[PDB]
């Protein structure tokens, strides 16, 4: 392996990719046969533009944008994370489940946030939900833009906000919202920040507590934890990041001079402070998908081959495009016994878990409590299940909040249009005499039949 740091940046990942394709660049230094990465969808898009040129397979573990499913432009992209379409539809289901129609949307200005928020907008207009504001954010965003977004959130009466963004891209916005103490919003989180340590920090709870977010299906990697604690800046020579990891873990330099004898368990860092391995299991499955493709190459038969006239490539002189081909016809069983089969776009269908941000009674941290799930293997309308008694709204409350633009019109009253406002924003207009309204949120007033007249309250007909 040759593993690099991207720093969530296109430039670093592109330098690493140029390192990967050096032999190919000379053709058009070891030969990278496949690449595992990357996390951000813009990063993976830039990397796939280059790796797909040389037909080097690229199996990502976190990039979940739908744009990466276009196999004409991304010829050699696979992923072990599911696509973002189901997640946007799932947030549309969540809003339609708690009976809201007046929500706002915030998205990272990148290939992750924008397509997901666009799919959410389509699903919302399909489910008769009104979107008040649609704001774009980035981690490298000026204070003017963040202040404008905060003003919009304040100038709005939408308690529910849908946020397609990562942790870093959302962080400045959350900082400015906390600094102004904007309490009382209901945050719906995509997978990228629903468990982010940059946002789920205890000093933001009054703003972000009670967040309802999505998580991937946890996996099992037996022995991975003991492997994690075996890290050492000197016992690990291949892992050049181990030195800086140790330095940042123990606040020392190889700052006090380090000892090389500190304990990993002494410090509390996300390195071993995990309860589920979700993206880590995606990395595990990326590596095992590549290995099982290579094994498929290694156990081929002269009459049964994916290539021309059933020919089998030799594993001693295997090329990257052959591993790509064997990754398009891959079907292997996991350690947990599930089958991993990439579709015609290299996407791995997967369930979602719905978590809620609750404060820790003892530690004071933010605990992610599974409150529901989203079953992508079920028909539309029966995919969501949320157990509403496990949800603490805003982190402390028990009452499902109100996020409609206008209060419901009682019986005997109709809906009236406020021009310059969406359809969900209506006023209540008393029915004229002789016309009744026996329902809640009725559009027009119903006329009484012959030999019949409306009540005093205009709710029904009396002879």
């Amino acid at each position: 392996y040759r593993i690099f740091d991207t720093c969530n940046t296109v430039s670093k990942a592109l330098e690493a990719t140029l390192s990967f394709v050096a032999q190919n660049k000379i053709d058009s230094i070891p030969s990278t046969i496949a690449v595992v990465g990357a996390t951000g969808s813009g990063v993976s898009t830039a990397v796939a533009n280059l790796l797909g040129l040389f037909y080097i397979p690229q199996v990502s573990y976190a990039s979940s944008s739908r744009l990466l499913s276009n196999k004409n432009q991304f010829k050699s992209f696979l992923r072990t994370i599911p696509n973002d379409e189901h997640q946007a539809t799932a947030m549309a289901d969540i809003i339609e489940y708690f009976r809201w129609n007046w929500v706002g949307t915030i998205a990272a200005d990148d290939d992750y946030g924008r397509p997901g928020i666009e799919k959410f907008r389509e699903e919302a207009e399909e489910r008769d939900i009104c979107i008040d504001f649609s704001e774009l954010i980035s981690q490298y965003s000026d204070e003017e833009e963040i202040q404008h977004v905060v003003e919009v959130i304040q100038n709005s009466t939408a308690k529910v906000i849908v946020v397609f963004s990562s942790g870093p891209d959302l962080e400045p916005l959350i900082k400015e919202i906390v600094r102004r103490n904007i309490t009382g919003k209901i945050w719906l989180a995509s997978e990228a920040w629903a468990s982010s340590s940059l946002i789920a920090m205890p000093q933001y709870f009054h703003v972000v507590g009670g967040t309802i977010g999505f998580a991937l299906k946890a996996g099992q990697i037996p022995g991975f934890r003991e492997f994690l604690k075996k890290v050492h800046p000197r016992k690990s020579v291949h892992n050049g990041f181990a030195k800086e990891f140790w330095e940042e873990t123990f606040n020392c330099h190889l700052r006090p001079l380090c000892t090389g004898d500190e304990n990993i368990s002494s410090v509390e860092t996300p390195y071993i402070d995990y309860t589920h391995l979700r993206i880590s299991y995606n990395v595990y499955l990326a590596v095992y998908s590549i290995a099982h493709a290579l094994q498929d190459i290694y156990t081929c038969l002269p009459g049964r081959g994916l290539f021309t006239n059933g020919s089998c490539a030799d594993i001693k002189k295997v090329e990257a495009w052959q591993v790509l081909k064997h990754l398009r016809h891959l079907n292997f069983t996991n350690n947990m016994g599930e089958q991993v089969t990439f579709d015609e776009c290299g996407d791995l269908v997967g369930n979602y878990s719905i978590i809620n941000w609750h404060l820790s009674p003892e530690d004071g941290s933010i605990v992610f409590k599974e409150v529901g799930y989203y079953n992508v293997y079920a028909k539309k309308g029966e995919r969501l299940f949320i157990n509403e008694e496990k949800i603490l709204w805003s982190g402390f409350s028990r009452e499902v909040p109100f996020s409609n633009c206008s209060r419901d019109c009682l019986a005997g009253t109709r809906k009236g249009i406020i021009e310059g406002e969406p359809t969900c924003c209506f006023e209540c207009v008393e029915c004229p005499d002789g016309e009744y309204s026996d329902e809640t949120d009725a559009s027009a007033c119903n006329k009484c039949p012959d030999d019949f007249w409306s009540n005093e309250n205009h709710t029904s007909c009396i002879a």
């Binding site: 392996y1 040759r2 593993i3 690099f4 740091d5 991207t6 720093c7 969530n8 940046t9 670093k12 990942a13 330098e15 690493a16 990719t17 390192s19 990967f20 070891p30 030969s31 990278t32 046969i33 496949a34 690449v35 595992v36 990465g37 990357a38 996390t39 951000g40 990063v43 990397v47 080097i56 981690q139 942790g167 870093p168 940059l198 291949h238 892992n239 050049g240 990041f241 800086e244 590596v287 590549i290 290579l294 594993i315 001693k316 295997v318």
Partner: peptide, 22 residues
Amino acid sequence: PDQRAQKKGDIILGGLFPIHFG
């Protein structure tokens, strides 16, 4: 890139991870 995890082998797998947030 000076910071890099390399181990030699018959078949080399590339890797891309965000060891730094930005």
